[PDB]
Every structure is written in structure tokens, then in C-alpha cells.
Amino acid sequence: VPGFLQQSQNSGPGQPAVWHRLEELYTKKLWHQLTLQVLDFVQDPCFAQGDGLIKLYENFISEFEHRVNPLSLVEIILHVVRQMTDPNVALTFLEKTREKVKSSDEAVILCKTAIGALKLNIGDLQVTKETIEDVEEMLNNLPGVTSVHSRFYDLSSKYYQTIGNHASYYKDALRFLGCVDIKDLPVSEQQERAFTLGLAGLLGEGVFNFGELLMHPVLESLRNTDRQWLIDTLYAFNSGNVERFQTLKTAWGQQPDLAANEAQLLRKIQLLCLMEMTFTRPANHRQLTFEEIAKSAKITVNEVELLVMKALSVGLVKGSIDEVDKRVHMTWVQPRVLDLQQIKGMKDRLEFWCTDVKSMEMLVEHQAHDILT
Amino acid sequence: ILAPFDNEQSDLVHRISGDKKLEEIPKYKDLLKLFTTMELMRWSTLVEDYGMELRKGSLESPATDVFGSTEEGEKRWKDLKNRVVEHNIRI
Numbered sequence: 485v486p487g488f489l490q491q492s493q494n495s496g497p498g499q500p501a502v503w504h505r506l507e508e509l510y511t512k513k514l515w516h517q518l519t520l521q522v523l524d525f526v527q528d529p530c531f532a533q534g535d536g537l538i539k540l541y542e543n544f545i546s547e548f549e550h551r552v553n554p555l556s557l558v559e560i561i562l563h564v565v566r567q568m569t570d571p572n573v574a575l576t577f578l579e580k581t582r583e584k585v586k587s588s589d590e591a592v593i594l595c596k597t598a599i600g601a602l603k604l605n606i607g608d609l610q611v612t613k614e615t616i617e618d619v620e621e622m623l624n625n626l627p628g629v630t631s632v633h634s635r636f637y638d639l640s641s642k643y644y645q646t647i648g649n650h651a652s653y654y655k656d657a658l659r660f661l662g663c664v665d666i667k668d669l670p671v672s673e674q675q676e677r678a679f680t681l682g683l684a685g686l687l688g689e690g691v692f693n694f695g696e697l698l699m700h701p702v703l704e705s706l707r708n709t710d711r712q713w714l715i716d717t718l719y720a721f722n723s724g725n726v727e728r729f730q731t732l733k734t735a736w737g738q739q740p741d742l743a744a745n746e747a748q749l750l751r752k753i754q755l756l757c758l759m760e761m762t763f764t765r766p767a768n769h770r771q772l773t774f775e776e777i778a779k780s781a782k783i784t785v786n787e788v789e790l791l792v793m794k795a796l797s798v799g800l801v802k803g804s805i806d807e808v809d810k811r812v813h814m815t816w817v818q819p820r821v822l823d824l825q826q827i828k829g830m831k832d833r834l835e836f837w838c839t840d841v842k843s844m845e846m847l848v849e850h851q852a853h854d855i856l857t
Numbered sequence: 858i859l860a861p862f863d864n865e866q867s868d869l870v871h872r873i874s875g876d877k878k879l880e881e882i883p884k885y886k887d888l889l890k891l892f893t894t895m896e897l898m899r900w901s902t903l904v905e906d907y908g909m910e911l912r913k914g915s916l917e918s919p920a921t922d923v924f925g926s927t928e929e930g931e932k933r934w935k936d937l938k939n940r941v942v943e944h945n946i947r948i
Contacts (some may be wrong), residue, residue: 797896 486510488541495534499525510545519551523559529566536567543581553587556630558594565602575602590629592620597635601642609646616643633663650690657681658697667702675706682710686718687741689748692756694722694820714738723751723823725781726758754781758795761812762803763819766833771811858891858923859936862943884910891940894948900941907937 489507494500503524509517524543526535543560561578568574569709579602596619603612614638623636640656643649667674681703691697698704698719707715713735720730734742735747742749758778762770778788781795791809803814822829829835849856860866870892879885887906890898910917911924923937924930 755910 485541485545489545493538493541495531495538496528499531499567501521510549515551518546519556520550523556526559526563533567533569536563539563539567542577547585553582553585554594554632557582558592558598561598562593565598565805571602571744572606574601575606578602582826590632591627594632594635596622597632597649600639604639604642604645613643613646616640616646627663630663630665634660637663648688649683650688652690652695652828653685654691654697657685657691657703660718661700661702671706674702675709678703678706679710681716682707682718684741686715686739689745689752690740692718692722692752694756695719696820698722705831707857711737722755722756725753725759725760725780727753728779728782731782741803750782754791754795754799755798758798758812759817759819762801762814762817764823766828767813771806771809771813773811774807796850858888858940859933861940861941862947866875884913884916891944897945897948898941903937903941 486507488634489510491500492832493503499643502521504691506518506522506525506849509522511700517580526542528535531538532636539560542806543564546556546560546622549556561582564578565571566802568578572579579595581816582598586592586595598617600612600615602621603610603615619636619639623632627633637656637660640659641653644653644656648668682790685691686698686707713733717727717730720727721734724730731750734747757777760780761772763770774788774792775785777792777795778785781788781791788810794807796805801814801817802815805812805814873879873890874885874892876885882900889895903929910920913920921929923933925933
């Protein structure tokens with residue numbers, strides 16, 4: 485063991501020096517240096533499988549060290565899977581070691597996240613999907629580790645792999661944003677994940693929130709690397725509605741997913757156009773001609789007499805609709821987010837009216853000052 | 858499909874709906890349209906959807922319950938048109 489670390493363990497440049505330092509930590513009993521510095525050398529991927537094979541020998545050293553499992557065991561397992569390569573039964577062994585030795589219950593939930601990922605690789609939407617449900621129970625309500633919630637997101641993203649349910653993907657990606665420590669995530673790797681998020685991830689019908697996720701800053705900046713026109717087309721479906729020029733562009737932006745759901749997405753933009761008139765314009769411009777709705781639903785004006793009824797049928801938002809000109813002037817609507825900087829919320833609509841009221845309130849006081857007494 | 862809308866009918870349809878064995882059957886997916894408000898279902902579209910009900914060729918075992926023939930079938934055929942027409946007015 486001491487001899488093994490001194491010469492055989494060394495592989496990459498600087499490994500003999502770091503392993504000699506590791507021996508000093510082993511004698512000094514400084515678990516923290518072993519927990520962070522030794523695992524940091526393990527974190528480097530240049531060694532790949534070779535560090536992982538050494539890691540099994542180091543795991544025996546780690547058992548003597550008795551470093552905290554939530555930090556030490558998870559890092560060891562992260563490179564243990566690299567050593568495992570294809571783990572037909574290797575996965576059972578690593579899970580067995582994690583189950584047998586648990587510093588804390590939180591480490592046990594971390595073990596579950598690994599079990600689900602390994603099961604996902606070998607099997608789809610079976611025990612692994614149920615294990616993803618089990619991990620939700622194991623996580624409970626504790627987000628203090630935060631990285632553990634990211635591991636929980638990883639199985640949630642794995643659930644998106646198991647069933648297309650792009651809505652589940654939309655929820656997990658949002659969960660990842662909350663449980664990620666910050667932009668400390670590798671920017672290029674996240675930009676590459678955002679390239680997929682920009683492509684299939686947002687092309688999936690699961691996310692279309694008028695910028696609730698699309699206009700969120702971290703992902704959109706990473707999605708700038710992904711084709712800008714496709715990213716614009718995603719905003720265009722939600723707020724640009726029909727966006728017929730963008731409709732030609734969306735086929736260019738991503739042929740996969742868009743072509744499969746083009747009819748369904750066309751229906752979704754038609755529904756989006758109906759929601760758009762009421763929330764964006766309150767009264768006045770909210771009322772609009774049938775031909776504008778025909779352009780909004782990208783359908784013929786004669787067809788829109790039939791089409792407006794179908795869009796009205798979805799009834800996502802309760803309202804009042806008049807078919808004299810197909811004008812909206814409807815009641816309740818839910819905007820995913822307000823446009824621009826909420827200019828309507830400023831003196832354009834609100835606040836300015838409130839200023840007018842207090843002057844009239846003063847008129848009531850002037851009308852009857854003696855009565856106020 | 859052959860029974861008129863009632864408070865009892867709605868509670869019963871929800872209880873039957875969601876059975877795992879029922880989920881496997883394609884017809885159950887067609888039957889769900891009445892259970893949900895589903896806006897309006899046109900009868901002409903339903904005839905295309907339920908052409909299988911007349912002769913599935915794989916199941917069709919309870920098809921006698923619906924359009925079996927005339928006395929217990931044509932009466933059922935009129936009932937389906939009436940119940941969907943009733944669905945159209947209710948929504």
C-alpha cells in the first residue's frame with residue numbers, strides 16, 4: 485500500500501509528488517487534505533480508467549481515512565463509474581459499498597441518484613423511473629447541499645430521456661438552474677448543454693413560456709452559441725404568434741422535433757395568438773378584425789370564421805368574445821410574463837390613473853370639508 | 858355512449874376511466890372524449906373513429922352491446938348520435 489502509492493500509483497506527470505504528499509496526509513491523518521486535494525487529483529480526467537482502477541485501491545485507503553461520505557464517497561463513485569466502464573455487475577458492487585457504509589442519510593440519497601443513473605443506462609422507464617420517484621422521496625425537502633438537488637435534476641432529466649414528456653424536461657432544466665451553485669458550471673459544457681437546450685430541449689413542445697425560461701439570462705447567453713435565428717424563432721412562437729417569416733425560419737432553425745410536431749406547434753401558436761391579443765392589449769387594440777386573427781392563426785379569413793371557434797374552444801383563459809369583427813375585449817387572461825419593462829404598469833396605464841384619483845379625492849374633501857369634521 | 862348525461866353517469870365514467878386494463882384498449886382512448894369536456898366532438902368524425910367498433914376483427918367482443926345489428930344495434934346507433942348531440946348542446 486505505501487509502496488504502491490509511491491511508484492506504481494504514479495501515472496500522469498506530477499503524480500509521484502502528489503502521491504508522496506498523499507502518503508504524508510495518510511501518516512498525518514489529515515482526512516480533509518485527502519477528502520479535497522487527493523479527490524481533486526482524482527477529479528482530473530487525463531488518467532481516465534487508470535485513476536479509477538487505482539481509485540479502487542485508494543477506496544480501501546479512504547475506508548481507513550473515514551472521510552465524510554457526502555463529499556468523499558460521491559467523488560470516489562464519480563470516477564468509480566469511469567473505472568467500471570460497462571458495469572453489468574460492477575454497478576451492484578459500487579452501490580453495495582455505498583449502501584453498506586453511509587456517513588449520513590444525505591449520502592444514502594446520493595447513493596440512490598447513482599443507482600438510478602446506472603439503471604437508466606442499462607434499462608429504460610422501468611425500475612429506474614420508479615427509482616427516480618424514490619429519489620424524490622429520498623431528497624425530501626432538503627436543498628441545502630444544492631448539488632444533491634442537481635443529482636436529483638440529473639434523474640429528472642433521465643426521466644425526460646425515459647419518456648419524451650418535454651414538459652418534464654422543462655421542469656428539470658428549471659430545477660437545474662435553481663440547484664446549480666451559480667455560473668460556476670463549465671460555461672462551454674453548459675453552452676453545449678444549452679446547444680441541445682437551444683435545439684431539441686426547447687424545440688420540444690414542453691417549453692414555450694414567452695421568455696419565462698427563454699428570456700432567462702444564463703441559458704439564453706449559452707444558447708447564443710446555438711443558431712440565433714432558431715433561438716429567435718422560439719421567442720417568436722410564444723410572443724410573435726404566427727410569425728410566418730419565422731415559421732419558414734423555424735424549419736431552417738431545427739428540422740428535428742419541429743417537423744414531427746409542426747401541426748401540433750401550429751395549433752399551439754394559434755392558441756398563443758388568442759392569449760396574446762387580450763394580455764398584450766387591454767381593451768381598444770385588444771378588439772381586432774377577424775382577418776388579423778386569420779393572419780394570427782395563419783389561416784384564410786373565410787376559414788378563420790371556422791378557425792376562431794377552434795381557438796376559442798381551447799378556452800385556456802376565461803373571457804368575453806364578440807364575433808362581430810372577432811374582436812376580443814375578453815375578461816380573465818394569464819400572461820406568462822409582462823412584455824418589455826412592464827411599460828403598461830408605469831404611467832402608460834397604472835400609477836397615472838392613481839394620481840388622477842387622489843386629486844378627485846381632494847375634490848370630495850373640498851366639496852364637503854365641514855362634513856369631514 | 859348509449860347512456861344519457863346524469864350526475865350518476867359522470868361519477869361512474871370517471872371511476873371506470875383510468876383502469877390499467879382499460880388503458881390498453883384503443884377504444885377506451887376513443888371513449889375518453891365524452892368523459893372530458895373535450896369541447897365539441899363532431900358525429901361525422903366519430904363515425905370514422907368508431908368504424909372499428911362495427912367490426913374490430915381483433916376484439917369486437919362487446920360490440921354487440923353497441924351496434925350489434927338492429928333491435929339492440931340500430932337503437933344503439935340512434936342513441937350514440939343522440940348522446941353526442943346532447944354532448945354538443947351541454948358544451
